[PDB]
Design a binder for this molecule. Structure first.
Ligand SMILES: [Mg+2]
Ligand SMILES: [Mg+2]
Ligand SMILES: [Mg+2]
Ligand SMILES: [Mg+2]
Ligand SMILES: [Mg+2]
Ligand SMILES: [Mg+2]
Ligand SMILES: [Mg+2]
Ligand SMILES: [Mg+2]
Ligand SMILES: [Mg+2]
Ligand SMILES: [Mg+2]
Ligand SMILES: [Mg+2]
Ligand SMILES: [Mg+2]
Ligand SMILES: [Mg+2]
Ligand SMILES: [Mg+2]
Ligand SMILES: [Mg+2]
Ligand SMILES: [Mg+2]
Ligand SMILES: [Mg+2]
Ligand SMILES: [Mg+2]
Ligand SMILES: [Mg+2]
Ligand SMILES: [Mg+2]
Ligand SMILES: [Mg+2]
Ligand SMILES: [Mg+2]
Ligand SMILES: [Mg+2]
Ligand SMILES: [Mg+2]
Ligand SMILES: [Mg+2]
Ligand SMILES: [Mg+2]
Ligand SMILES: [Mg+2]
Ligand SMILES: [Mg+2]
Ligand SMILES: [Mg+2]
Ligand SMILES: [Mg+2]
Ligand SMILES: [Mg+2]
Ligand SMILES: [Mg+2]
Ligand SMILES: [Mg+2]
Ligand SMILES: [Mg+2]
Ligand SMILES: [Mg+2]
Ligand SMILES: [Mg+2]
Ligand SMILES: [Mg+2]
Ligand SMILES: [Mg+2]
Ligand SMILES: [Mg+2]
Ligand SMILES: [Mg+2]
Ligand SMILES: [Mg+2]
Ligand SMILES: [Mg+2]
Ligand SMILES: [Mg+2]
Ligand SMILES: [Mg+2]
Ligand SMILES: [Zn+2]
Ligand SMILES: [Zn+2]
Lengths: 149, 69, 114, 50, 60, 91
RNA sequence: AAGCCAGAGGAAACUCUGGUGGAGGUCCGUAGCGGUCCUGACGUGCAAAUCGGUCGUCCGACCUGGGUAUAGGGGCGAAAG
RNA sequence: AGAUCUUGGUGGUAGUAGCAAAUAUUCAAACGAGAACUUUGAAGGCCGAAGUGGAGAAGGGUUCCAUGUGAACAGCAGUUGAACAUGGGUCAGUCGGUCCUGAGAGAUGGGCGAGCGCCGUUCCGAAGGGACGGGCGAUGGCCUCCGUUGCCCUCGGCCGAUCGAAAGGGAGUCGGGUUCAGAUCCCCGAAUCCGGAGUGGCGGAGAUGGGCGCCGCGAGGCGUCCAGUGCGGUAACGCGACCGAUCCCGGAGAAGCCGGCGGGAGCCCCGGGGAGAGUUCUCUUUUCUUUGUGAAGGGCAGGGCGCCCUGGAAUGGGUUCGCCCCGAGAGAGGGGCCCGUGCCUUGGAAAGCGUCGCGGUUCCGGCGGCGUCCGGUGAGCUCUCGCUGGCCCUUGAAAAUCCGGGGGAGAGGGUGUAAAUCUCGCGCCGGGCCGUACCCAUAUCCGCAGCAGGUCUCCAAGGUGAACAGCCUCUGGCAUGUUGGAACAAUGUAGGUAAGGGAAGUCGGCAAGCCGGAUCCGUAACUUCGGGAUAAGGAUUGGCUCUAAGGGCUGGGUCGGUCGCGGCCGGCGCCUAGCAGCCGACUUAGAACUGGUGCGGACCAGGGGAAUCCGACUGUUUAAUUAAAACAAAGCAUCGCGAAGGCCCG
């Protein structure tokens, strides 16, 4: 609720104790239930896989890009959005990407990201057509909608 | 309440230790024996009058045989 | 008609204030406060939407006073998973483990060369 | 209401007990100067504090 | 029927009645009166008559 | 018979909101409420559950797709681009 | 309204007819909510804002109880200080 | 003597205004000093099930209920009272609170702060005080032996105290009787949940069978060896249990709104059979009332299934009101499971009720007779269960709590009338604390009050009718809303009517009036093609007597060729254009007859058209003079910001 992008409930195996870990990814457009996704350095180019941008080709596009190495996804998360890998350089471990706004940004080559666009398509294409549908849309987000000039 | 189908399994519930009393009710077409145990009230229904006559005299001693009429 | 009243102090038509009409031996209509409708368990596969068979559908705390047989089925994963998806997992476990034997032999005939 | 706490009910009990007239024999005491119970409270005329 | 201390529960009321009247009681009910005094309905055992117990208590 | 001449599905909106806004939302509502064929089981039972979520009633397979269409033309060219970059990544 | 069934006219392109269906910040209109006009009643009132008729809306930005949160140059305001 | 002076008292006004919102009272009697108002009876009326009825939540706090008083109060009165006085009244394991979390509140650590303190709620903490497992021992003691106890080994994150709902979640109580006032709480009777059991309370299960040496005519026994933590069905799954920890997985709790169908109940309706009343001037086999079976078990209908087996379908078929379904297994045949609130049964008739009587015990859960029966209906109303859809840039709680499965660490006996163990049947004990009366409103609450205001819900009969509309009625309730009597002046408030004219009135058709329901016709400009539209305009409408049309159930046999006036197999036959009998809803159409042309006869119930301005629309707004053209709105456009950030609090 309050988001255009659907969420994927991925289940991994905990590598240290007998347990099942449940992650909440942002669904990339194309992934389905009962599908394996692979996260790591050795994961290969497939939609939904979470692999570092430093091991990607120079034209691939990503879904949930990290702003910093180590944290979790922070960029291109809203529905239909993506970043693009522009260039790397093996020296100084840097990678330049193109954000959804068109800004070019330099991030570390260890930053992880899902592969593909994020599901939710062109949600903004449909006219709302109704004050009531704008009321319901913002009732799920916050108290900001009826704007007095 | 529990219903008892045949005769001999009513006899040992009648002679059970927690059996407080036995009540004999006569109707137009059957006779009902009701032993009041601790949890349930076991009712055994006999349509034959002479069968109920024999069962009435076959009850264990030391138990109430109160008749309802 | 003879009209009825609530027998408890909850006067609102909430989900726990559900009643049904009953005729007493005294020939009057009264409310009988019903229990909630129980649900059979879903399947642990989380795929097929039907609920399990052979298991009584009651409220969760009723299951404490039920017999063991009434709460499960005589099968592996009985009472927790459907029969259909148990057959699939039995086949899946066998066939993938056979595939492991396939690739182990396949690399074993690969390592015949330096 | 019908639903009350113990503290509220205990409070209403005291206010009930002290809402009674003075005994007749009080007026015969020497140096009495008390005519009636001036702290009487009717449930409709004035309401309780709580 | 007794007027009892407001802090006395059913266990204490039953035990008190049992010892100082030498009777056996079956069950005890309890309400608090609108004046604040607790009142106990103490049902005696079937082999104890409430009428002649109340006689020797002195409330005939 | 043919009950309307041109409004189609947006006849439910009456005269409101303007002709071009009803026309713009007409093609979106047709695709959003349409039943697509499932690519996993072949049955035409894949219908939208929420925005971006598509679900097949037969095989109970849920997929992440577009807001109104099952898959956007953006993601279709993306999946093809990733495949070409993968086959370029190896040799 | 969409969806669906049947029939008819067409060389195709396609078009037409009768049903079915039950959409909608849809219409008439109760309860509810509101408060247009009579500038009616009353105006030392029933009432420190009420009453009568007539009215607006009545599946939705709907009405409403209780529980919470926001406190004075602060709050909150589909905005009238 | 003044200060619209302060406090207190008193006049004229003035026996004046007034005691006029919601139709209404009347007769007789009783008590009593006293009756328009009390009570009883009889009439006439109202509320008319969206109540003036029956019950609750909040709030009140004794107003509840008996008896008495007649001072003051109840704006008249009162013999009455929600007044006054004296007493009495609220009984729980299973109705709530209590328990859980929700939005949120809030300590501790830490940080800040002159300081009371306040920031923060996992953040900057050495935040687990628990555990069957085992070892070291104490032998504590019915020292056989298993229970205590200290330390150690091993395992253990809800990762955060705590509070937060008498409408959310949350195990399990119902039937009858009873009081002046309490009852799902008391009594009677039927159950049921949770917790406990060390000596193990009884059973049953586990679990008690084979092989061989012999004995014994055999049947039946002795010794050894070997198993035995249940069994059945192809399957869905079933059976009365069915060893098992740490750990893991899952389920239930746990889910929006709207639509259309179907099942069940309660109510309503119809035809009879009883019992009791009502009418009888005449008719009326008539009119009215009444005509039960709780929970909890067992069995069976019935509803549902996205469950199984056989088999393999196009000349595609199955099927719904709609849909929809099928080589990923249709149709068909046979099964399995769930729910079972329905019926029968134990409860159960002994109770209850209706009647007709007999006793008395100031005032009996008295006693007795008879009955408590058979059917038919439905787009009917209300609940409830189920199926299937639609809508969302809206996806419609959480946690206590309970359960199933995976795994197999372990445990238990050496063939004993056996062990460990048991979610199986029965038996034993306990369930503490607080609330519980009453009002719940034109008189028990707030509004200074018995104030036309305000204040959250549940149940919901007949007629008419589209209807929870309006109008009338039944069950239930009441006395006209803080007075009565007599008149019927003006002026008024509220309601009507009005000849001829028809807005000439007025700032202005303000107000009032016209229209109005349904059926059949017929509908313009303009238009964003959806609308305009009930456009505009016209006809009909009663009563009575018919006639058509629209259904559902059964049975459709050619025969003794024999005997299980009847049945198995069949020489023996062609309803196959379908009939024959029975049963029952409304609804539509057509016609005749008929009335002083009157007929949506009350009630209900759009005046219409042609334009100009503004706002797109729906919505919102100054509670108490402005509902608008004002605000909002979707749409359009611009601006800032890549988090070391934008905007903002502090
Ligand atoms: Mg604006
Ligand atoms: Mg019944
Ligand atoms: Mg008051
Ligand atoms: Mg109590
Ligand atoms: Mg509307
Ligand atoms: Mg309207
Ligand atoms: Mg307003
Ligand atoms: Mg106004
Ligand atoms: Mg005025
Ligand atoms: Mg101004
Ligand atoms: Mg002076
Ligand atoms: Mg002077
Ligand atoms: Mg006067
Ligand atoms: Mg007057
Ligand atoms: Mg009336
Ligand atoms: Mg009422
Ligand atoms: Mg009274
Ligand atoms: Mg007076
Ligand atoms: Mg008093
Ligand atoms: Mg911890
Ligand atoms: Mg709490
Ligand atoms: Mg509750
Ligand atoms: Mg009462
Ligand atoms: Mg019965
Ligand atoms: Mg089939
Ligand atoms: Mg009887
Ligand atoms: Mg009460
Ligand atoms: Mg009044
Ligand atoms: Mg009032
Ligand atoms: Mg006040
Ligand atoms: Mg009326
Ligand atoms: Mg009047
Ligand atoms: Mg009067
Ligand atoms: Mg005239
Ligand atoms: Mg005229
Ligand atoms: Mg003029
Ligand atoms: Mg003039
Ligand atoms: Mg007018
Ligand atoms: Mg027009
Ligand atoms: Mg006619
Ligand atoms: Mg407007
Ligand atoms: Mg505009
Ligand atoms: Mg105003
Ligand atoms: Mg524009
Ligand atoms: Zn499954
Ligand atoms: Zn599919």
């Amino acid at each position: 609720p309050g988001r255009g992008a659907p969420l994927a409930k991925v289940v991994f195996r905990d590598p240290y104790r007998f347990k099942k870990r449940t992650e909440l990814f942002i669904a990339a457009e194309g992934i389905h239930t009962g599908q394996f996704v692979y996260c790591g350095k050795k994961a290969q180019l497939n939609i939904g896989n979470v692999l570092p941008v430093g091991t990607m080709p120079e034209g691939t596009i990503v879904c949930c890009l990290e702003e910093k190495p180590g944290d979790r996804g922070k960029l291109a998360r809203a529905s239909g959005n993506y970043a693009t890998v522009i260039s790397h350089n093996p020296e100084t471990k840097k990678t330049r990407v193109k954000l959804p706004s068109g800004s070019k940004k330099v991030i570390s080559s260890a930053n992880r990201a899902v592969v593909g666009v994020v599901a939710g398509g062109g949600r903004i294409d449909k006219p709302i057509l109704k004050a009531g549908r704008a009321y319901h849309k913002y009732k799920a987000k916050r108290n900001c909608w009826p704007r007095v000039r | 309440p529990r219903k008892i189908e045949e005769i001999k399994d009513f006899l040992l519930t009648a002679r059970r230790k927690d059996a407080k009393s036995v009540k004999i009710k006569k109707n137009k077409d059957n006779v009902k024996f009701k032993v009041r145990c601790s949890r349930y009230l076991y009712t055994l229904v006999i349509t034959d009058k002479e069968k109920a006559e024999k069962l009435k005299q076959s009850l264990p001693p030391g138990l109430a045989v109160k008749e309802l009429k | 008609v003879q009209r009825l009243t609530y027998r408890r102090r909850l006067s609102y038509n909430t989900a726990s204030n559900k009643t049904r009409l009953s005729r007493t031996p005294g020939n009057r209509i009264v409310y009988l406060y019903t229990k909630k409708v129980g649900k059979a368990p879903k399947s642990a596969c989380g795929v097929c939407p039907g609920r399990l068979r052979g298991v009584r559908a009651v409220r969760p705390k009723v299951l404490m006073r039920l017999s063991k047989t009434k709460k499960h089925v005589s099968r592996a994963y009985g009472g927790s998973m459907c029969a259909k998806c148990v057959r699939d997992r039995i086949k899946r476990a066998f066939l993938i483990e056979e595939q492991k034997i396939v690739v182990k032999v396949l690399k074993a005939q690969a390592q015949s060369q330096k | 209401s019908s639903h009350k706490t113990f503290r509220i009910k205990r409070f209403l009990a005291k206010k009930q007990k002290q809402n009674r007239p003075i005994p007749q024999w009080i007026r015969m005491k020497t140096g009495n100067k008390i005519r009636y119970n001036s702290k009487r409270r009717h449930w409709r005329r004035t309401k309780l504090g709580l | 029927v007794f007027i009892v201390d407001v802090k006395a529960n059913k266990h204490q009321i039953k035990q008190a009645v049992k010892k100082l009247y030498d009777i056996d009681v079956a069950k005890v009910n309890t309400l608090i009166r609108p004046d604040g005094e607790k009142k106990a309905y103490v049902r005696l055992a079937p082999d104890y008559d409430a009428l002649d117990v109340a006689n020797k208590i002195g409330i005939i | 018979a043919k009950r309307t001449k041109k409004v189609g599905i947006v006849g439910k909106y009456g005269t409101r909101y303007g002709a071009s806004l009803r026309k713009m939302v007409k093609k979106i509502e047709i695709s959003q409420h349409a039943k697509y064929t499932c690519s996993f089981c072949g049955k035409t039972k894949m219908k939208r559950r929420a925005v971006g979520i598509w679900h097949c009633g037969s095989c109970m397979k849920t997929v992440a797709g577009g807001a109104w269409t099952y898959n956007t033309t953006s993601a279709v060219t993306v999946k093809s681009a990733i495949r070409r970059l993968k086959e370029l990544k190896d040799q």
